[PDB]
Structure formats: structure tokens, C-alpha cells
RNA sequence: UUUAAUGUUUGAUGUUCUAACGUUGACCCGUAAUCCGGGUUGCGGACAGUGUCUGGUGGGUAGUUUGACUGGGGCGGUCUCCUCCUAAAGAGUAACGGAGGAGCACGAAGGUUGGCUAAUCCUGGUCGGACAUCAGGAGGUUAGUGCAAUGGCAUAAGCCAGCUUGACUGCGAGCGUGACGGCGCGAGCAGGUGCGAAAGCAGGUCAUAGUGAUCCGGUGGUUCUGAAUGGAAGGGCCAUCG
RNA sequence: UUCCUUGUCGGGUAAGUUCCGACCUGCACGAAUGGCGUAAUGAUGGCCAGGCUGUCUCCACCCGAGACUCAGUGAAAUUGAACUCGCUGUGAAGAUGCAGUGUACCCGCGGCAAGACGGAAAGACCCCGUGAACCUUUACUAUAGCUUGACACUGAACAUU
RNA sequence: UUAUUAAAAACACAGCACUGUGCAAACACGAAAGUGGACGUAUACGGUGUGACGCCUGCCCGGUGCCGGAAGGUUAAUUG
RNA sequence: GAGGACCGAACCGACUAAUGUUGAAAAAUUAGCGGAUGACUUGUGGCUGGGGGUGAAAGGCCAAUCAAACCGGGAGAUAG
RNA sequence: CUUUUGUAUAAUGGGUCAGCGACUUAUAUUCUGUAGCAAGGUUAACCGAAUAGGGGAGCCGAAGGGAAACCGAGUCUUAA
């Protein structure tokens with residue numbers, strides 16, 4: 001019938017890009033699905049928010065037999 | 077407090093707590109005030125005479141603030157454990 | 173808009189209680205669960221009661 | 224004449240040591256079954272008034 | 288066992304009565320006065336009427352309210368939330384721009400351990416058919432996910448079974464997002480618990496909608512307060528409801 | 530009272546969206562917020578005809594009062610300042626004032642009203658203001674009045690129970 | 691009749707109808723006393739609608755109002 | 771010799787047109803017009819007062835004033 | 851000049867001159883400057899041949915945390 005509705009933007013996306021130094025608990029990326037997967041020292045929240053489980057620099061890699069993007073923390 | 081019609085800050089927040097009528101008759105005394113008293117022995121009356129606490133004060137507590145140098149006899153006053161040590165360290169005496 | 177709010181009262185003497193919802197049309201049986209009672213600091217059984 | 228305190232503000236804000244104001248959180252009066260316990264737990268302690276709102280509070284509590 | 292009738296309290300009314308009260312009936316006096324008052328009398332009579340309280344009625348009168356957006360206003364539509372596009376490869380981004388949804392559900396559809404892997408089609412086969420259950424091959428997720436869309440999902444987040452209540456209490460490093468009120472994510476710590484041989488996992492559900500500040504008030508609790516004192520009322524605090 | 534609509538038919542006129550008569554298809558007549566008739570009446574509405582005419586074709590002349598000139602007296606609205614032309618273009622988008630160009634010796638008097646978005650009245654229309662007034666009602670909240678009962682002023686006797 | 695842009699088809703009207711009113715009338719002006727109604731008494735008075743006269747005035751009581759009814763349901767102060 | 775009868779002066783009114791519109795005039799003049807024994811007109815005096823009066827009803831009129839007069843006061847009302 | 855996205859504007863206001871004509875006052879509060887004193891500072895009413903002096907009632911500050919009891923350089927939260 002009639003349009004005119006929308007929802008508030010959710011501010012998704014990457015918060016800390018490759019090489020950035022983060023503290024433990026820092027949110028790395030907010031996402032709906034697991035577009036990015038948790039690697040080493042990275043947790044996956046209930047809404048699939050990837051957060052650093054240790055200090056260090058974030059690192060993006062593509063691994064596995066399905067070429068999936070992983071995010072890990074190079075502990076430094 | 078008017079914010080253009082939006083529910084102002086002091087109305088969208090809840091009220092909390094209550095006012096104690098005993099807090100209005102309670103005062104705190106610094107160690108540096110023990111020398112201002114006259115006679116050495118300190119109590120409610122001597123503190124009021126020295127214009128240190130209000131005339132309506134019924135309870136008084138000595139806290140570790142400032143410093144005491146002379147032997148003082150505290151009587152009928154609550155004393156913190158930190159001030160109790162400092163008063164006894166200056167040869168003072170505390171009696172309930 | 174069918175689920176009614178209920179409360180689960182602890183079997184212990186303490187008046188502590190949880191609150192939850194329940195569809196009383198499909199599930200007429202009383203709800204009983206083992207939940208942590210923070211007053212006695214033990215896991216006791218909680219029985220249903222009216223809110 | 225003396226400035227009159229907004230009495231409604233005096234019942235909701237307490238002045239702290241460094242001049243800030245503490246206040247109770249909202250959203251903790253009624254319907255609470257639907258609220259997560261984690262959410263309700265984080266609303267129990269008192270909070271400080273944000274920097275953007277101090278101007279409104281100070282104007283309402285001149286003797287605080 | 289029961290029944291009647293004389294004696295009593297309070298009502299429930301009524302037919303009498305006169306003495307309150309009414310009289311815009313008559314007569315007398317104040318008084319050379321159709322006011323008023325007094326008197327006599329008649330007629331009413333505990334009614335009527337008035338005061339306080341109370342239900343109903345009450346535009347007779349009064350005080351007021353009767354939204355905004357808007358390719359002028361009105362009319363119609365819209366107003367909060369979720370998903371996609373517009374949106375210009377970080378975030379955000381308008382229009383009465385283009386399309387759809389939500390105002391819930393679930394004590395299992397949650398937790399854990401163990402297992403499992405679709406759609407569709409072909410071939411063969413009692414009733415049986417285009418389509419039921421059976422068997423095989425092809426196929427490779429074209430399926431499924433409590434519900435819109437999007438992003439996800441095989442280690443399955445999809446399907447099945449066992450045992451269960453972590454849909455725990457206190458907290459919380461550190462971040463995300465908001466002008467703010469707020470909202471969101473969260474390892475780890477303490478207490479206690481479930482499943483597993485164990486490593487471990489569990490602070491609801493694949494994720495993102497399913498919602499309402501404050502005031503006032505209710506219910507339960509409470510080594511808080513208690514207006515001379517002891518209590519209590521009330522208030523506070525905690526849980527929760529409208 | 531009929532939107533469609535100048536309905537259709539008839540009458541009147543050389544020609545009639547009006548008028549009169551009828552038809553009924555009454556958008557959306559109708560019986561005391563009356564229906565249909567109706568003689569008389571009307572500074573009432575519509576239409577027709579005779580008479581009459583400067584109403585007109587189409588104006589002409591004339592008589593008076595002004596206008597005009599002289600003497601006397603002597604206002605008003607309005608007014609940023611003015612050394613105050615046309616045109617085309619430009620530009621808060623319709624120019625005396627800008628650009629280009631044309632024209633134009635200085636100053637009166639009688640006339641005419643195209644312009645000075647002329648004068649006059651802080652638009653009556655329209656919108657807006659969490660403006661106003663008055664009016665309406667089954668808006669809200671009250672209330673005078675009206676009405677109900679209780680108690681009081683207010684008593685006795687007796688039935689009935 | 692709109693003094694000062696509307697004189698009319700508007701208002702009034704005689705007539706008609708309904709309805710209220712038994713007299714200390716209804717009703718109106720009055721915190722009240724009182725006064726008007728009326729020094730009148732239902733052939734009177736008030737209100738409402740219609741509007742000379744002629745022929746007439748059909749159907750609907752579901753809605754709203756008004757009138758009557760009193761059994762039942764509900765229901766105030768009061769009582770406790 | 772009846773009549774809210776007829777024609778028509780005074781008188782009362784105000785239908786049409788022109789003029790006037792910084793007027794002769796804050797409503798008139800000129801020429802016509804209606805009523806003109808009546809629900810007529812007029813003098814003097816009186817009464818009704820502002821949410822009130824009065825109104826053959828136009829929201830008309832109530833001192834050139836009216837969908838609530840005038841004067842003083844609240845009052846420097848308030849004016850996003 | 852005003853008002854505007856924007857004015858020679860044909861948008862507003864002003865005929866001219868002269869005079870008058872609009873951010874004040876009181877009391878609180880906060881900040882800055884400056885002066886005095888300084889872990890202290892200062893008095894109010896009032897007394898007073900009174901701008902002196904007296905008056906320290908008070909107020910602010912040197913301690914906070916907690917709803918509160920309470921504790922106190924810590925305190926609250928919690929069984930911790």
C-alpha cells in the first residue's frame with residue numbers, strides 16, 4: 001500500500017582495522033551473521049560481535065577449506 | 077530546566093532516598109579543633125562553648141583530620157579508630 | 173497477549189521469588205524449577221504462585 | 224529575594240565530592256519481568272550526571 | 288416435643304388526635320392603614336415548608352479543550368519499533384521516495400552430551416491416484432531456521448534422542464552506540480548448579496522487531512528510619528505489579 | 530427545490546439559456562418546521578403588449594451654475610532625497626534612476642488620466658499564534674434551578690406486622 | 691424590520707392545534723420579602739408550532755424526548 | 771354613516787435615480803415614492819442597566835459606541 | 851534603515867528641524883578581575899556624639915562515603 005517506514009541504523013561494521021592495537025575486551029567488528037569468524041584470542045558474542053580476548057594487534061586472515069575470513073589477535 | 081517540551085532531566089529520573097532527622101543533630105570534629113577547646117577535657121558542652129559545633133548538636137564524632145599535640149581527655153564522644161590512635165599517641169585519654 | 177505473568181516462590185523460608193510468563197491455556201500444570209536462592213545461597217526448588 | 228530551589232530536582236540529585244551530581248537510574252520502577260537480570264543489575268547503582276547535562280542541574284540546584 | 292395469646296425494644300406502615308408549624312379564611316385591636324403585629328376563631332396539621340447532608344437531572348449558566356506533519360490549508364494518509372534499497376565500497380545521511388514486517392511465541396522451541404544431514408527428480412513397487420509410505424540412483428542445500436527481510440549457518444545455528452534448569456545470584460577489565468535519558472557486547476572473579484569420562488560448555492532462544500520515562504499507588508521482604516520515650520503509622524532500601 | 534440542463538414538446542419572437550403551458554426521468558417535492566388552490570392587496574420577483582419617448586441609431590443647438598481671466602481671502606490628503614525622457618535588455622524575476630541605444634533648447638497655462646506596482650486603511654480573503662470573543666451540542670469539568678431520601682424544626686394515641 | 695449599503699418571499703397578524711395551569715395557578719423578576727400574571731379563575735392564563743379563507747392534513751412509537759406504570763434488578767447519604 | 775376602506779396636504783416614513791463623497795450635511799439635497807382615523811403620530815414626565823435591559827426578531831437598539839455600553843481600577847494583563 | 855537565501859528595488863519606515871525617547875533597579879546566586887586576611891575568613895539585627903568601636907547569633911571553608919543507621923581517609927556495594 002504505502003511506504004515511508006524504516007528502522008534506525010545499527011552502526012555495524014569493523015571498529016578496529018588490521019594492525020590496530022587493542023585492549024582485552026575491545027570490540028573488533030559488529031555484524032549480523034558471522035561474515036568474519038573468531039580466530040586466536042578472539043571471542044564471538046551472542047550477537048556474533050567479535051571482541052578481543054587479549055591485548056595485541058588485530059589480524060585479518062583467510063583460512064580453512066572454505067576460504068573464510070578470520071580475525072585474530074597477535075598478542076604483543 | 078525547560079528543554080523545549082521534552083521531559084526535563086529532573087523529571088525523567090526517579091526520586092530516591094529520604095532525609096534523616098538525626099543527621100541534622102550530628103557533627104564531626106577534627107583533631108585540630110581539640111586544642112581550641114578550653115580546659116583540655118572535651119565534651120558536648122565544651123565544644124559548643126568553643127563555637128566548634130552547633131548549639132543543637134546532640135552527637136559528635138572526632139575524626140582523623142588535622143593533628144593534635146597536647147594531651148586531651150575526650151568524654152562522651154564517638155571517636156574513629158584512626159583518631160583514637162592519634163589522641164592516645166599524644167598522651168590523651170578517651171572515656172565513654 | 174495470552175501469556176500471563178507468574179512468580180516462582182522459593183520452597184525455603186525466605187520470601188525470595190523469581191518472575192516469569194506462562195501460557196495457562198496449554199500448560200495448566202504448575203511450574204516447578206530448581207533455582208538459586210540468594211538468601212540462603214543454595215539451589216532450592218521454586219514453585220509457582222500468583223503474581 | 225533568595226533563589227528558590229527546584230524542589231523536584233533536589234529529590235533526585237545529590238552533590239558529590241568534586242562537585243558532580245549522582246542520581247538513580249531510570250527504567251527500574253515497573254515492568255521488570257521482561258527485563259534481563261543483567262540489565263536490571265546494571266541499573267541499581269547510582270550514576271553521575273553527564274557533562275552535557277550539568278548546566279541544567281546546576282541551574283536548578285543553586286544551593287546544592 | 289410443639290402451639291396459642293395477653294405483657295416489651297426496635298422498627299414496618301396507616302386511621303384517629305392537637306399542641307408545634309402553615310393560613311395570600313373571617314372578625315377584633317394597635318389605627319382616621321387591603322403593610323405589619325397582637326388577639327379571637329375556623330380550616331389544615333406533624334403534613335407542608337426551611338437548614339445540613341445526599342442521589343438524579345441540569346448548554347439555564349460558566350470555565351475551557353478540540354495535535355502535528357503537509358510542495359498553501361482542508362480531506363485522505365502518517366506519527367513507535369525491525370529488515371532491505373535509495374546511501375555515492377568505514378560510520379551516518381532526506382523526501383507524502385521504492386518494498387515488507389513487529390506490539391509475540393517457547394519449561395522447550397532453553398542447557399548439555401551423543402548422533403544425524405536436505406530440496407527436487409528419476410526407476411521399481413498392493414490398494415495408491417500428478418502428489419502418502421518402501422527401495423535404489425541422480426542431485427548437492429536449489430532444503431531447513433517458531434515469524435518479515437537481510438546477514439549467517441555442515442564443527443552445522445538445521446534434524447533426533449538422553450539427562451536436565453545457567454531462562455543462576457553478586458560483580459565486572461575493556462569496548463560499542465547515543466545531545467541526553469539510555470541501549471548494546473563482554474573475558475574474567477566469588478557463590479552455588481546442570482550436562483560430559485574429560486578437555487569443557489551453559490548468565491535463555493542464529494542475530495537484528497515483540498515496546499513506555501517520571502509521578503502516584505499496590506503486594507512481599509527488610510541486623511534502615513520511627514517528631515518526648517517504647518512501639519506503631521508513614522517513609523526508605525530490595526524484589527515486583529498497574 | 531432539477532445536478533445532468535439551454536431536458537423534451539407546445540405557445541409567444543425573423544431569431545427566446547428568461548417567460549407561459551404541458552410531460553415525469555422528483556440528482557435531492559410532499560402534507561401544520563404544513564400540502565395544494567385562492568378573489569383582493571404589494572415602492573415584491575419574472576415575462577409580454579399598447580402608448581410614450583435623446584434609452585439608442587447619433588448626437589445637435591440653446592438657457593442657466595461651475596470650469597477659465599482679474600481683484601480679495603485662502604485650505605487638504607501626500608512627501609527619503611531628486612538635476613524626475615523613449616526603447617530593448619538586465620535585475621528581489623513588470624526600471625525615470627542599471628547596461629546599450631534613441632531622442633530631447635529653458636519655463637508656464639488649459640486639458641486627459643496610461644505609469645509613478647499613484648493616495649487612503651500595519652488585507653477583511655488565505656495561512657499562522659499551544660491569540661481572543663461570542664455561539665452550538667449526546668466534548669470535558671462544574672454549577673443555578675428542579676427533584677429524591679436521611680436527620681433537624683417534630684408531638685400524642687392506636688391498629689397492621 | 692437591519693438609525694447609517696438589505697423593506698423583502700423576512701417579522702407580526704386574525705385563525706388553527708398541541709401542551710401546561712384548580713388559584714398562595716403555571717410562569718417570570720427577585721439570595722429573601724415581595725411583585726407581575728390579575729384585583730383575572732379553565733369561554734381564563736402561560737408556552738410552543740402553524741399562519742386569512744377553501745379542499746385537506748396519509749404511514750412509522752424502532753431512535754430521542756415526554757407521559758403513565760410499578761413487580762423485579764441496580765443504586766446515595768445514613769446505619770455499623 | 772361602518773372601515774387597521776379609497777384619493778390626497780400637514781405630519782410620519784424612506785422605494786428609485788441623480789447629485790454630493792477633503793460634502794451645505796460623520797447619512798443630506800433635488801425630482802418622483804409609501805402610510806396618512808390608526809397595530810397612527812407627537813409633546814411633557816416617568817420606569818426597565820450591561821451577560822443585564824428592550825426587541826411585530828435585523829444580533830436590532832441601549833447618548834455619532836454594541837456577538838456584551840461607557841468611565842475608573844486590577845494594570846506596566848499577556849504578546850514563542 | 852529594516853527584514854531577508856536575496857533589495858536601486860516597484861518590500862517596510864521616515865515631510866523637515868529642534869527637544870524627548872529603549873538593557874535599569876533591588877535582592878539572591880555563580881564565574882572573572884582586583885584588594886584584604888588566610889586554615890581560616892566574615893559578621894547580621896542591634897548598641898554607639900554612630901562611616902569608628904562593640905556585637906561572632908550565624909554563614910562559608912578545612913572530609914568524605916551511604917537511601918539511612920552508621921563508618922570515616924576512607925566508604926558504599928556484596929556472603930566476600
Ligand SMILES: CC[C@H]1OC(=O)[C@H](C)[C@@H](O[C@H]2C[C@@](C)(OC)[C@@H](O)[C@H](C)O2)[C@H](C)[C@@H](O[C@@H]2O[C@H](C)C[C@H](N(C)C)[C@H]2O)[C@](C)(O)C[C@@H](C)[C@@H]2N[C@@H](COCCOC)O[C@H]([C@H]2C)[C@]1(C)O
Pocket residue numbers: 649650791
Ligand atoms: C465614500 C468614500 C469612502 O470610500 C469608499 O466608499 C470606497 C468606495 C471604498 O470602497 C468601497 C466600494 C468597493 C466596491 O471598492 C470600490 C468595495 O470593495 C469596498 C470594500 O468598499 C474604499 C475604496 C475601500 O477601500 C478598498 O478596500 C478594499 C478592502 C480593498 C481595496 N483595494 C486596496 C484593493 C480598497 O480600495 C475602504 C476600505 O473603505 C477605504 C478606507 C481607506 C476608508 N474607510 C471607509 C469607511 O467606509 C467604508 C467602511 O469601512 C469599514 O471610507 C473610505 C476610507 C475613508 C472613504 C474614502 O471615505
